Amino acid sequence: SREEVESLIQEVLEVYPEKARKDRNKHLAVNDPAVTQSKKCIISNKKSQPGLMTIRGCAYAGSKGVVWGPIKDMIHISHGPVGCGQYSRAGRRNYYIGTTGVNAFVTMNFTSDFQEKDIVFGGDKKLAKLIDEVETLFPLNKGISVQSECPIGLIGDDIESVSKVKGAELSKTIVPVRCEGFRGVSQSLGHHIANDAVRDWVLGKRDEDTTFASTPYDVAIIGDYNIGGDAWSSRILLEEMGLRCVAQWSGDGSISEIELTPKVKLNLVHCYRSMNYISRHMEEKYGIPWMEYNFFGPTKTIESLRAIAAKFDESIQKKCEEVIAKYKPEWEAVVAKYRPRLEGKRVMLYIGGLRPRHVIGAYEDLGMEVVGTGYEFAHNDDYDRTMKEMGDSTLLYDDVTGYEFEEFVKRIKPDLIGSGIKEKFIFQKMGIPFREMHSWDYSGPYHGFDGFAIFARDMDMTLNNPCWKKLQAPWE
């Protein structure tokens, strides 16, 4: 009821002082899918209002936690005091194959553990010596990045001179990343900062190298961080269709992969938010075209598989249909098992910058409707894409506060909530089934045909779990 949603938004807003009330109305909207530009109904990518318990992270999360950290054969230095690196050690399931501590380092926390002497006197000498110790104790690393924490740029250390000086000295790729948390307003700027850091320090390292054997079917998966194996559940289908995935950015990614990406003929972009910057750059510097796709659920996977096949020739279009034919019984049996258990059930979402629109189709493939969705840090070009994908008169919330989300859920009463760790235990208290839609609740993958079976399994396991019937005592 569009009139009832508008009333819900106004009611919830009455708690705020006038200043926050005015700002937050701009970040809330009843969806209208015919509108051509989302900025006319909801604003995004703004500062969070102080004290309202935003769910957002910082630019260091967006750059170290999200983009740089998954690269497996580099070592990433959380540069600054000991917190950022510890809370973000092995919290994100960006999966990989390697010998951790030996040739891979992803789930390890390397840090400069700033003490007051480093804040008072500068960190650049310490950073210098730290790189020597890294090279001494971890000789198989293939590059070092420097993930700046808040104090770095505040004391004005010079991590570029060190990255230039020590880089020439030891003949290794050493990447200064100015992702200090005070920059920007969310993880989003971290994305952009890290993309530029790749561009400025790594991506052009083979610009004068014609020795790679390029085929007509070379692609790169851009913006899939392989959560629980998501990128592998996608890579198998691309290669079974007859393409060769030279690179994965950045889940299970290797630095050589990144350096070989400018040799690719087509950039397949899953996460538009975090890596559309480098996609546009590669189209500019190297002329590599790029397209967005979606491997959530069979409806979207089939659409993308054929959209991607269309950019190549008939031999790729033919293996494409042989892949869609290969998997049809597999996903049709998942639908048959689990759509009867889920049809008509209502779900509300809140995630970061892609999944709050990209999973809609997978839910519709099981007969559920998303009646509420929202992002921590999306931009207007994300909401452009969202409004088309959500039903009319559904609720959109940008940088939702804890208070609003609890109030929306209380009035809307969804059957399932898909959000993050900081939300999970709140709504279970209320007796609302909850699935983590960042960590997949330690399950997955959810990408592709194999991921859909696991997703359907996971929504049903929790929505229909017997625990949710026993919240009220039989005696009040």
Partner 1 sequence: SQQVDKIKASYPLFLDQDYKDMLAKKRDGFEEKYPQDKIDEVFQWTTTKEYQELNFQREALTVNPAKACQPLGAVLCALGFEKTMPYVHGSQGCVAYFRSYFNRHFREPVSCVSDSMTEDAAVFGGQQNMKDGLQNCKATYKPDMIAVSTTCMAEVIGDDLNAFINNSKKEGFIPDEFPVPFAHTPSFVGSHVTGWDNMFEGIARYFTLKSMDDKVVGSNKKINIVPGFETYLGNFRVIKRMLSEMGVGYSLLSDPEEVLDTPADGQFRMYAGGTTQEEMKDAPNALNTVLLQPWHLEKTKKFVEGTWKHEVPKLNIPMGLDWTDEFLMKVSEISGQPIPASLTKERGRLVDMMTDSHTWLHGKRFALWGDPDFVMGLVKFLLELGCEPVHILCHNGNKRWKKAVDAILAASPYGKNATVYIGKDLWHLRSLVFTDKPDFMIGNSYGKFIQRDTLHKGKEFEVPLIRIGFPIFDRHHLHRSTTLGYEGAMQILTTLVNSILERLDEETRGMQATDYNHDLVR
The residue number whose beta carbon is nearest to ligand [S] equals 107
Give residue for tokens 């929202």. Answer: 374
- Beta strand 75-79 pairing with 28-30: unpaired
Q: In the set 29, 222, 247, 349, which binds Mo ion (CB under 5 A)?
A: 29
Q: What are phi and psi of 336, to 5 degrees?
A: -60, -40
Residue 108 binds ligand [S] (CB under 6 A): yes
Q: Which residues, 305 to 334, sit near partner 1 by CB under 8 A? A: 326-327, 330, 333-334
Instruction: Read off the tokens for 332.
Output: 């049709």
Residue 37 binds ligand [S] (CB under 6 A): no
CA 269 to chain centre: 12
Active site residue 231: no
274 binds, among Mo ion, partner 1, ligand [S], none (CB under 5 to 8 A by kind): none
Q: In the set 236, 302, 316, 412, which binds partner 1 (CB under 8 A)?
A: 236
What is the length of the chain?
476
Minimum CB separation from ligand [S] for residue 202, in Å? 9
Nearer Cβ to ligand [S], position 96 or 338? 96
Catalytic residue among 29, 58, 197, 245: 58
Q: Which residues, 171 to 210, sit near ligand [S] by CB under 6 A? A: 200-201
Q: In whole angstroms, what is the distance from residue 314 CA to residue 216 CA?
A: 12
CA distances from 309 to 10, 140, 238, 317 (A): 47, 38, 9, 5
Active site residue 178: no
Minimum CB separation from ligand [S] for residue 105, in Å? 8
Catalytic residue among 191, 273, 355, 358: 191
Active site residue 357: no
Q: Where are the beta strands (DSSP E) in 251-403?
A: 266-269, 290-292, 346-349, 369-375, 395-398
Q: Is 41 annotated as a binding residue?
A: no
Sign of the CA dihedral 272, 358, 107, 157?
A: positive
Minimum CB separation from ligand [S] for residue 200, in Å? 5
Q: In whole angstroms, what is the distance from residue 55 CA to residue 232 CA?
A: 29
Q: Binding segment for partner 1 among 115-123, 305-313, 352-360, 411-419 (CB under 8 A)? A: 115-123
75, HSE (Cβ side, Cα atoms, 13 Å): 26
Query: Under rule CB under 5 A, how many of the chain's residues touch Mo ion?
Result: 2
DSSP state of 469: G
Question: Which candidate, 182, 185, 167, places its Cα nearest to that of 127?
Answer: 167
Q: Is 438 annotated as a binding residue?
A: yes
Binding mask 75-104 for ligand [S] (x = CB under 6 A): -------------------------x----
Q: Which residues, 339 to 398, sit near partner 1 by CB under 8 A? A: none
Residue 154 binds partner 1 (CB under 8 A): yes
Residue 119 binds partner 1 (CB under 8 A): yes
Minimum CB separation from partner 1 for residue 119, in Å? 5
Nearer Cβ to partner 1, position 140 or 168? 140
Nearer Cβ to partner 1, position 376 or 389? 376
Is 393 within 8 Å of 5 (Cβ atoms)?
yes
Instruction: Tell me which amino acid residue 13 is.
Output: L
Residue 150 binds partner 1 (CB under 8 A): yes
N-term to C-term CA, the chain:
33
Is 320 within 8 Å of 302 (Cβ atoms)?
no
Q: In the set 25, 103, 107, 439, which binds ligand [S] (CB under 6 A)?
A: 107
Q: Is 58 annotated as a binding residue?
A: yes
Q: Where are the beta strands (DSSP E) in 376-458?
A: 395-398, 416-419, 434-436
Q: 3-class DSSP state for residue 409?
A: helix
Q: In whole angstroms, what is the distance from residue 216 CA to residue 233 CA?
A: 23
Q: Is 320 annotated as a binding residue?
A: no
Q: Which residues, 407 to 436, sit near partner 1 by CB under 8 A? A: 420-422, 424-431
Residue 395 binds Mo ion (CB under 5 A): no
Minimum CB separation from partner 1 for residue 330, in Å? 6
Q: In whole angstroms, what is the distance from residue 436 CA to residue 29 CA?
A: 24
DSSP per position, 298-332: HHHHHHHHHHHHHTS-HHHHHHHHHHHHHHHHHHH
Residue 113 binds partner 1 (CB under 8 A): yes
Question: Which candidate, 78, 80, 103, 81, places its Cα nearest to that of 90?
Answer: 78
Q: In the set 6, 32, 41, 52, which binds partner 1 (CB under 8 A)?
A: 52
Considering all CA atoms of the chain, what is the largest pairwise distance in Å, rounded to the nearest integer?
77
Active site residue 320: no
Question: Which candidate, 86, 145, 79, places its Cα nearest to that of 118?
Answer: 79
Nearer Cβ to ligand [S], position 202 or 362? 202
Residue 128 binds ligand [S] (CB under 6 A): no
Q: Which residues, 69 to 98, sit near partner 1 by CB under 8 A? A: 73, 80-91, 93, 95-98
Residue 375 binds ligand [S] (CB under 6 A): no
Interface residue list for Mo ion (CB under 5 A): 29, 290
| Binding-site residue ranges for [8Fe-7S] cluster | 58, 84, 150
| Binding-site residue ranges for [7Fe-Mo-9S-C-homocitryl] cluster | 271, 438
Interface residue list for ligand [S] (CB under 6 A): 100, 107-108, 200-201
Catalytic residues: 58, 61, 92, 191
